Amino acid sequence: ADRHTVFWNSSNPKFRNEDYTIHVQLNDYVDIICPHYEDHSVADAAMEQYILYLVEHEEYQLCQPQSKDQVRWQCNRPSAKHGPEKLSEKFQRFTPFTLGKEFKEGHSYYYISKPIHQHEDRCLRLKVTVKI
């Protein structure tokens, strides 16, 4: 598939106006790349970490999950030896796994985060629209 890379970190200016949106096709992947740090550049406490949620429009608008059920992934490996922790979501129409998400042409879908290096100063969120 075409894959779409999203760097999920507060330094990414794409998040600056709270309206980061990407446009994908069915069966594309979105690779959400967690913040990641080389072994000495930044103090441990300054390293960003997030809970990622996949939520409905109302939760995206409020930037607040409605329930823990919406946790999609956690960016909790900020200095992992191999490189950044990555969530790779395939925008597939059907799943055999009932905790996962189905995606439809012509629909839009939403990720928000909450910080674990938690002074929530700012909303990071993402809208993904699936074409026909």
């Binding site: 999609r72 059907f94 799943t95 905790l99």
Partner: protein
């Protein structure tokens, strides 16, 4: 029990060969019971002609002669799709092969022997999505005597909607 392979225990660090490349089985990530898990999944139940293979790494046999192979997996009912998928299946095939050398990326179907056609004891239906109900099947088979230096397992999908969450291979000592 001496465990020779355990997919879930690798926590996503283990990647298996897929054939044909970029069609078929995909490694997916989800949270279940508040922990991150990985699974190989495929669901091409609408189109013609699926023949998607997932093959493990080469597994060194050591002294194992008879291995037990435990699978845990979900399968979705072919009647649970809006279309009505007339090319949908609810089984998949389990195979193995022994070899004295790892072939690496040179995957040859013909060297594999079928162990079994695997079917879900409990099928996933529509109403399971809204209930967030996971019907996780368990099937175990055994193969032997093994005699070569290592072996592979492989899974062949022919148009089912299947997620494979656990593959454990072990032998028994006394």
């Amino acid at each position: 029990e001496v465990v020779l392979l355990d997919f879930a225990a690798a926590g996503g660090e283990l990647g298996w060969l897929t054939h044909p490349y970029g069609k078929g089985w995909d490694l997916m990530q989800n949270i279940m019971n508040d922990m991150p898990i990985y699974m190989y999944s495929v669901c091409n139940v609408m189109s013609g002609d699926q023949d998607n293979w997932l093959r493990t790494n080469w597994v060194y046999r050591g002294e194992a002669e008879r291995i037990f192979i435990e699978l845990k997996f979900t399968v979705r009912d072919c009647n649970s799709f809006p279309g009505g998928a007339s090319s949908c299946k609810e089984t998949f095939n389990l195979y193995y092969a022994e070899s004295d050398l790892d072939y690496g990326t040179n995957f040859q179907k013909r060297l594999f022997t079928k162990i079994d056609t695997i079917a879900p004891d409990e099928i996933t239906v529509s109403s399971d999505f809204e209930a967030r109900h996971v019907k996780l099947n368990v099937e175990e088979r055994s193969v032997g005597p093994l005699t070569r230096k290592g072996f592979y397992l492989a899974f062949q999908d022919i148009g089912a909607c299947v997620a494979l969450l656990s593959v454990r291979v072990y032998y028994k000592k006394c």
